[PDB]
Amino acid sequence: TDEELTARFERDAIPLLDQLYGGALRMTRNPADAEDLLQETMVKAYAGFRSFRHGTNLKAWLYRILTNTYINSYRKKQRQPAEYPTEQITDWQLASNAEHSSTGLRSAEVEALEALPDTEIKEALQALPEEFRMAVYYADVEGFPYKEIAEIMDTPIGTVMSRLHRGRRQLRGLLADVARDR
Amino acid sequence: LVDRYGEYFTGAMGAESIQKLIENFDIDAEAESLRDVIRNGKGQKKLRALKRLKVVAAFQQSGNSPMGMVLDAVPVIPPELRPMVQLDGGRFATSDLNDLYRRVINRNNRLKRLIDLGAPEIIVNNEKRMLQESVDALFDNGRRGRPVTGPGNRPLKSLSDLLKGKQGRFRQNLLGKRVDYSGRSVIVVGPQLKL
Amino acid sequence: LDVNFFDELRIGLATAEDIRQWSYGEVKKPETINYRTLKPEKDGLFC
Amino acid sequence: AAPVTHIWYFKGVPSRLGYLLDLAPKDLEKIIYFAAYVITSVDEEMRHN
RNA sequence: CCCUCGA
DNA sequence: TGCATCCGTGAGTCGAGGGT
DNA sequence: TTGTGGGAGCTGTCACGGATGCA
């Protein structure tokens, strides 16, 4: 009697839609929200229409389904990021947000300097011998794993590690401008 | 008319019906009829037919089928162009575009759920109409009926608004823009200067 | 880098096939970002 | 899940769809927003026989 | 975007 | 079918700092 | 998911052109 149940639905529940929408408008105050909530109520009501006892007042039953889906909507929105929609995001807002972000609103000058040499660092690296500079560059500038650093310089792991630790020492000596930055 | 005579025709509601009509549409036939009407006719029928021909003759050049006027897939703008930023207070500010796309998504998914549940045709039709209306808002809000509103009964600016006015991209960001190496200050006379 | 000598700029209607040829995946979920981790939810508008 | 019309071409005056199908925009409004059906096809041979 | 102000 | 009505279009520039 | 159950605003704008629709 499944199609009989859905026909009973189209006979009984559908003429209640106007009053149910009036109530949804009362409790949402936004017509698009009320339409969304009424269609949600209809999904939740047609899903379990067998569970309604034929004969009693289905107005109150559907109204309770409406109020319960509204309550669940409020509880779910309380668990979402609270969003306020704006016509335009303000420059003050972009900057305020940039104040707590992992990367700021960077300027063209910052980018330019970052793409230009860091003279104190470049000279220190150029002071090292070739093998040591290459080992430290591959190791803790590009971050390769030590076996890969070996395979690029075709020397065993131990001697790449030797070159690495000793080039780190030599650069630690060469960089007295760590105190300027540390 | 469907209970009897049902296997003799197809009828339907909505954009799917409009899409079928465009499918069965013979552009050469209608273009020829309109050319005939404008050549051998006179009066306001001539003028209305010239109006109607401006569309068909244009759709009659290098493909460009009118099927593009009905959509089965909506494109979603890259998310950088619709930012979401955290505010002092733990609250967020989102561009309206995200609320519009979110209503489209919600209604499309609810329509999927109804189609799966084999809901009454009246309810599924309600959901299809709501989906149409939410895409209408996304594209050009307020153009038909009420505009989707945010708090303070403020109509959400759609994709059409982003382009129009002295605030749209054309007048606000392409024909003029903020520049670097520029300053501003009060002026004083300084009569000792040269021209 | 674009040499900025474009001959012409042309519109037409997009087909649903064009709209899918642009897309990198369907946005299936309405959720934006986690209220806790501030990270973009999968299949959402910021996925 | 269901096709949708572009509001630029339905409601943008003059309705380009209206000019395209020779339909009144009033009737297109009835159709697109589920107020009235339209006959998309008819089997004239079967109707005749 | 809005509010109050400035030329 | 000939208009009347209804609708949709447009309505100055740049600044400051405080807000949803 | 069961006696009952329709929003908060709003107009205090103006000129013009053309589709829309109506008798």
UniProtKB/Swiss-Prot annotation, chain A:
Cellular component, GO, one term: peptidoglycan-based cell wall
Region (Sigma-70 factor domain-2) residue spans: 17-79
GO molecular function: DNA binding; sigma factor activity
Motif range (Polymerase core binding): 36-39
Region (Sigma-70 factor domain-4): 120-171
Domain of life: Bacteria
Induction: Poorly expressed in exponential phase; induced by heat shock (20-fold, 45 degrees Celsius). Induced 10-fold by the thiol-oxidative agent diamide within 30 minutes of exposure, by 2 hours expression is again normal. Autoregulates its own expression, part of the sigH-rshA operon.
Protein's GO biological process: cellular response to heat; DNA-templated transcription initiation; regulation of DNA-templated transcription; response to heat; response to nitrosative stress; response to oxidative stress
Annotation: DNA-binding region: 146-165
Modifications made to the protein after synthesis: Phosphorylated, possibly on 2 residues, probably by PknB. Phosphorylation of SigH has no effect on interaction with RshA.
Keywords: DNA-binding, Phosphoprotein, Sigma factor, Stress response, Transcription, Transcription regulation
Family: Belongs to the sigma-70 factor family. ECF subfamily.
Record's comment describing the protein's domains: The sigma-70 factor domain-2 mediates sequence-specific interaction with the -10 element in promoter DNA, and plays an important role in melting the double-stranded DNA and the formation of the transcription bubble. The sigma-70 factor domain-2 mediates interaction with the RNA polymerase subunits RpoB and RpoC.
Other information: Was identified as a high-confidence drug target.
Assembly behavior: Interacts transiently with the RNA polymerase catalytic core formed by RpoA, RpoB, RpoC and RpoZ (2 alpha, 1 beta, 1 beta' and 1 omega subunit) to form the RNA polymerase holoenzyme that can initiate transcription. Interacts (affinity=15 nM) 1:1 (via sigma-70 factor domain-4) with RshA under reducing conditions; the complex is disrupted as temperatures rise. Phosphorylation of RshA decreases its interaction with SigH, leading to increased SigH-mediated transcription.
Name of the featured protein: ECF RNA polymerase sigma factor SigH
UniProt organism field: Mycobacterium tuberculosis (strain ATCC 25618 / H37Rv)
Upper lineage: Bacteria, Bacillati, Actinomycetota, Actinomycetes, Mycobacteriales
Swiss-Prot record, chain B:
Induction: 6-fold repressed by starvation.
Family: Belongs to the RNA polymerase beta' chain family.
Subunit details: The RNAP catalytic core consists of 2 alpha, 1 beta, 1 beta' and 1 omega subunit. When a sigma factor is associated with the core the holoenzyme is formed, which can initiate transcription.
Entry function: DNA-dependent RNA polymerase catalyzes the transcription of DNA into RNA using the four ribonucleoside triphosphates as substrates.
Full protein name: DNA-directed RNA polymerase subunit beta'
Lineage, highest ranks first: Bacteria, Bacillati, Actinomycetota, Actinomycetes, Mycobacteriales
